[PDB]
Amino acid sequence: GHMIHKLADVQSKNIGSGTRIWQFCVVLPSAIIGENCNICSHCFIENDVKIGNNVTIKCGVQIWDGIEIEDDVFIGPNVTFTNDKYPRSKQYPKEFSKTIIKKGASIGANATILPGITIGENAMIGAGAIVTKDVLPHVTYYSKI
Amino acid sequence: GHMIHKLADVQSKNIGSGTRIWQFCVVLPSAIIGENCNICSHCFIENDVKIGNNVTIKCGVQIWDGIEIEDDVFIGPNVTFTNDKYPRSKQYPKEFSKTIIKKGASIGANATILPGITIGENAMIGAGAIVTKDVLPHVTYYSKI
Amino acid sequence: GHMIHKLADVQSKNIGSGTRIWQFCVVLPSAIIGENCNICSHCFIENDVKIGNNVTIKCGVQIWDGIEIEDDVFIGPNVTFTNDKYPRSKQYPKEFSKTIIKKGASIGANATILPGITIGENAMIGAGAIVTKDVLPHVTYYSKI
Ligand SMILES: CC(C)(COP(=O)(O)OP(=O)(O)OC[C@H]1O[C@@H](n2cnc3c(N)ncnc32)[C@H](O)[C@@H]1OP(=O)(O)O)[C@@H](O)C(=O)NCCC(=O)NCCS
Ligand SMILES: CC(C)(COP(=O)(O)OP(=O)(O)OC[C@H]1O[C@@H](n2cnc3c(N)ncnc32)[C@H](O)[C@@H]1OP(=O)(O)O)[C@@H](O)C(=O)NCCC(=O)NCCS
Ligand SMILES: CC(C)(COP(=O)(O)OP(=O)(O)OC[C@H]1O[C@@H](n2cnc3c(N)ncnc32)[C@H](O)[C@@H]1OP(=O)(O)O)[C@@H](O)C(=O)NCCC(=O)NCCS
Ligand SMILES: Cc1cn([C@H]2C[C@H](O)[C@@H](COP(=O)(O)OP(=O)(O)O[C@H]3O[C@H](C)[C@@H](O)[C@H](N)[C@H]3O)O2)c(=O)[nH]c1=O
Ligand SMILES: Cc1cn([C@H]2C[C@H](O)[C@@H](COP(=O)(O)OP(=O)(O)O[C@H]3O[C@H](C)[C@@H](O)[C@H](N)[C@H]3O)O2)c(=O)[nH]c1=O
Ligand SMILES: Cc1cn([C@H]2C[C@H](O)[C@@H](COP(=O)(O)OP(=O)(O)O[C@H]3O[C@H](C)[C@@H](O)[C@H](N)[C@H]3O)O2)c(=O)[nH]c1=O
Ligand code: NA
Numbered sequence: 001g002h003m004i005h006k007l008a009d010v011q012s013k014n015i016g017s018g019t020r021i022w023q024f025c026v027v028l029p030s031a032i033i034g035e036n037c038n039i040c041s042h043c044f045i046e047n048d049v050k051i052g053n054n055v056t057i058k059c060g061v062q063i064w065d066g067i068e069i070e071d072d073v074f075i076g077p078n079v080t081f082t083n084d085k086y087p088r089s090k091q092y093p094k095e096f097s098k099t100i101i102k103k104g105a106s107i108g109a110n111a112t113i114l115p116g117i118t119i120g121e122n123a124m125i126g127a128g129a130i131v132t133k134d135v136l137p138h139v140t141y142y143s144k145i
Numbered sequence: 146g147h148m149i150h151k152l153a154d155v156q157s158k159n160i161g162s163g164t165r166i167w168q169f170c171v172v173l174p175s176a177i178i179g180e181n182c183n184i185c186s187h188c189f190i191e192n193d194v195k196i197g198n199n200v201t202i203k204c205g206v207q208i209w210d211g212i213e214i215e216d217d218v219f220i221g222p223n224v225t226f227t228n229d230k231y232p233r234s235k236q237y238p239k240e241f242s243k244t245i246i247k248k249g250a251s252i253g254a255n256a257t258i259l260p261g262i263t264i265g266e267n268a269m270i271g272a273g274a275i276v277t278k279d280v281l282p283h284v285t286y287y288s289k290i
Numbered sequence: 291g292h293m294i295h296k297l298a299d300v301q302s303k304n305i306g307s308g309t310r311i312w313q314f315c316v317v318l319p320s321a322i323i324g325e326n327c328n329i330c331s332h333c334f335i336e337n338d339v340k341i342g343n344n345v346t347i348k349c350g351v352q353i354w355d356g357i358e359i360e361d362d363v364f365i366g367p368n369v370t371f372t373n374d375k376y377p378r379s380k381q382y383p384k385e386f387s388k389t390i391i392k393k394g395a396s397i398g399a400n401a402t403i404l405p406g407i408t409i410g411e412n413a414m415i416g417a418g419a420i421v422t423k424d425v426l427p428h429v430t431y432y433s434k435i
Contacts, residue, residue: 007299009152009168023299024169024314024332026186036380041316041334042169042350044186044204056379059334059352060187060368062204062222074379077352078205078370080223080255082272087251089201089219090181106377110370110402112255112273127372128402128420128433130273130290143273143290145420145433154297154313169314171331187314189331189349205332207349207367223350225368225400227417232396234346234364235326257400257418275418275435288418288435 012045016053031063034071048096058109066096073101076109076127085115102137157190161198176208179216193241203254211241218246221254221272230260247282302335306343321353324361338386348399356386363391366399366417375405392427 004010007023016035021027027045034053039045044062051063052071060078063069067081083096097115101107105119108127113119118134125131126142135141149155152168161180166172172190179198184190189207196208197216205223208214212226228241242260246252250264253272258264263279270276271287280286294300297313306325311317317335324343329335334352341353342361350368353359357371373386387405391397395409398417403409408424415421416432425431 023316024187026168042187042205042314042332054380056377060205060223060332060350072379074377076370076372076377078223078255078350078368080221080272082221082254086269087201087219087221087253088249089217089251090199104378106379108377109372110255110368110400114272124376126420127370127404130271130288132290143420145422169332171313187332187350205350205368223368223400225366225417227366227399231414232346232364232366232398233394234362234396235344255400259417275416275433277435 022059040077052103064096066098068098068100070101070103070105070121072104074106075101076107076111078110079107080110080112082113082115105135108142167204185222197248209241211243213243213245215246215248215250215266217249219251220246221252221256223255224252225255225257227258227260250280253287312349330367342393354386356388358388358390360391360393360395360411362394364396365391366397366401368400369397370400370402372403372405395425398432 002015002019008025010027011029012031014032018036021039022041025043028047030047031045031049033051037055040059042060046065048065051069057075058077064083066083102121104122107125111129113131120137122138123135124140129143147160147164153170155172156174157176159177163181166184167186170188173192175192176190176194178196182200185204187205191210193210196214202220203222209228211228247266249267252270256274258276265282267283268280269285274288292305292309298315300317301319302321304322308326311329312331315333318337320337321335321339323341327345330349332350336355338355341359347365348367354373356373392411394412397415401419403421410427412428413425414430419433
């Protein structure tokens with residue numbers, strides 16, 4: 001089975017065995033979540049979303065439509081994803097940009113990921129980084145201070 | 146009418162027709178919100194706050210006392226506002242700094258807005274930007290990496 | 291007494307007189323919180339956590355295992371802490387890195403604090419800063435744009 005906290009609003013039935021979803025999470029009906037994930041408190045997970053197995057999503061993360069997370073990915077707290085490069089209120093694009101975070105990659109706390117981004121397998125994104133371009137497999141990327 | 150999610154704590158009656166306020170939002174009594182706004186999950190909206198019509202506020206946004214949002218504004222997820230330039234615990238200023246986000250402006254995901262800031266009409270703030278000075282109407286501003 | 295909002299999940303009994311804990315907070319059993327703290331909405335507070343007296347924690351803050359906050363500290367909204375320098379999903383270190391935020395220090399909104407960091411007494415961390423090294427007592431530190 002999976003553990004859905006009574007204080008979460010989980011509307012998806014597509015949740016793998018051993019997955020925990022914690023307090024004050026919202027998960028919309030079409031979200032797919034694999035086995036042995038940890039979805040920590042205060043996350044939002046939209047409809048057009050696929051999350052693999054053994055994925056850690058720390059508190060305060062929103063996963064928008066068009067975002068895929070592969071197996072064994074770590075997403076740090078307050079990591080921010082985007083799917084609309086030039087957002088204007090009530091101006092809905094035909095297609096949202098797709099982001100993919102590839103197997104085993106890690107995104108540091110409070111990093112910001114621009115639309116249409118690929119983060120390669122086993123990459124490491126520094127805490128607080130702004131990711132405006134694809135990060136290659138196994139690369140450590142951070143924003144200079 | 147307006148839609149207030151049963152899992153929100155909305156204490157304001159000042160909410161325009163067609164406005165949606167989603168799960169785990171807090172809205173204090175004196176907040177004014179216009180028509181056809183979307184206040185996504187996990188937002189906080191204080192008392193001395195005015196939000197216009199057709200405003201999109203994505204997840205994880207707090208709008209403090211002294212902040213005005215004009216019509217047609219887009220606020221990206223996890224955008225952070227401030228109203229106290231030199232904060233010390235339990236040291237309350239006589240007046241909070243005022244921020245105004247002007248008609249049609251857009252603030253990218255996880256941007257940070259310093260106190261007393263004006264963001265001009267139709268401006269575009271890059272995701273993850275730190276805004277330490279006013280942004281002119283129609284200007285695209287982002288922090289260099 | 292202390293005020294625990296009915297919409298918070300506070301599991302700790304170790305909460306000082308005059309402390310307020312607001313909506314959609316999670317506080318795990320072993321957390322220690324002093325007197326006259328304000329824990330604003332949408333915070334997460336883990337087990338191996340000590341918070342002193344008169345501490346302000348604004349919305350959207352997570353305090354992980356290994357983090358101590360001394361008296362009179364101000365933590366801005368959406369400040370992000372970390373306790374694992376090279377995070378990989380399901381790879382648990384023997385010891386989490388310890389962070390200490392020393393008496394009277396202030397951390398600006400949406401700042402990011404790397405693991406093992408000391409922020410000295412009465413320091414001021416700029417909004418949106420990335421803190422990769424200890425900040426000395428009474429120093430104002432911010433990330434250049
Ligand atoms: C990116 C990271 C892996 C760097 O590790 P590293 O390659 O060992 O880097 P170092 O610690 O040797 O630092 C090298 C330099 O980059 C800087 N730097 C390190 N991490 C940085 C970051 N995230 N942003 C900006 N600069 C950073 C250091 O200040 C140092 O600068 P210097 O050479 O001028 O002294 C690490 O700092 C990090 O960000 N880890 C993620 C932590 C996290 O978010 N955990 C998840 C929540 S628990
Ligand atoms: C700011 C923004 C509009 C820039 O669009 P643009 O003017 O087309 O910019 P470009 O994509 O041409 O990039 C120009 C340069 O600025 C950099 N850049 C772009 N956006 C940046 C940002 N937010 N922060 C830092 N650098 C940024 C690019 O890396 C590029 O650098 P280069 O010239 O060295 O290659 C866009 O990148 C952005 O941030 N959009 C907001 C996304 C968002 O938050 N959506 C809301 C949630 S869905
Ligand atoms: C860091 C801070 C205290 C700086 O105050 P200060 O020392 O008076 O700095 P100034 O306003 O004189 O700015 C000096 C320069 O640093 C820049 N700067 C200021 N704060 C900055 C920040 N947080 N990040 C990056 N640059 C910053 C300014 O743009 C200015 O650049 P310039 O010299 O090129 O014009 C203040 O800007 C700040 O970040 N306050 C925290 C606000 C907050 O988070 N409040 C909590 C929530 S209410
Ligand atoms: C009991 C409880 C837990 N949680 C979440 C938030 C908390 O940190 C986490 C603990 O589960 P875990 O499996 O021990 O930890 P997790 O894998 O998420 O993260 C930990 O390990 C990794 C490797 C570190 O990088 C990370 N910084 C740690 O927090 O689960 C909640 O969100 N609510 C809860 O009530
Ligand atoms: C069903 C549901 C929705 N929401 C919020 C969060 C979700 O993304 C949003 C969907 O409503 P929308 O009107 O389709 O989308 P919105 O206008 O907010 O944003 C979308 O369109 C803009 C133009 C894009 O830039 C943006 N990135 C998109 O998310 O409403 C919640 O917070 N909880 C919910 O249960
Ligand atoms: C009524 C209510 C309040 N709160 C929190 C969030 C809100 O901003 C705060 C008000 O309490 P306060 O003691 O007046 O304010 P606080 O000390 O936290 O912060 C204020 O003063 C400091 C000095 C400023 O730097 C800061 N920017 C201010 O918000 O308490 C909630 O989280 N939920 C609530 O329902
Ligand atoms: Na943030």
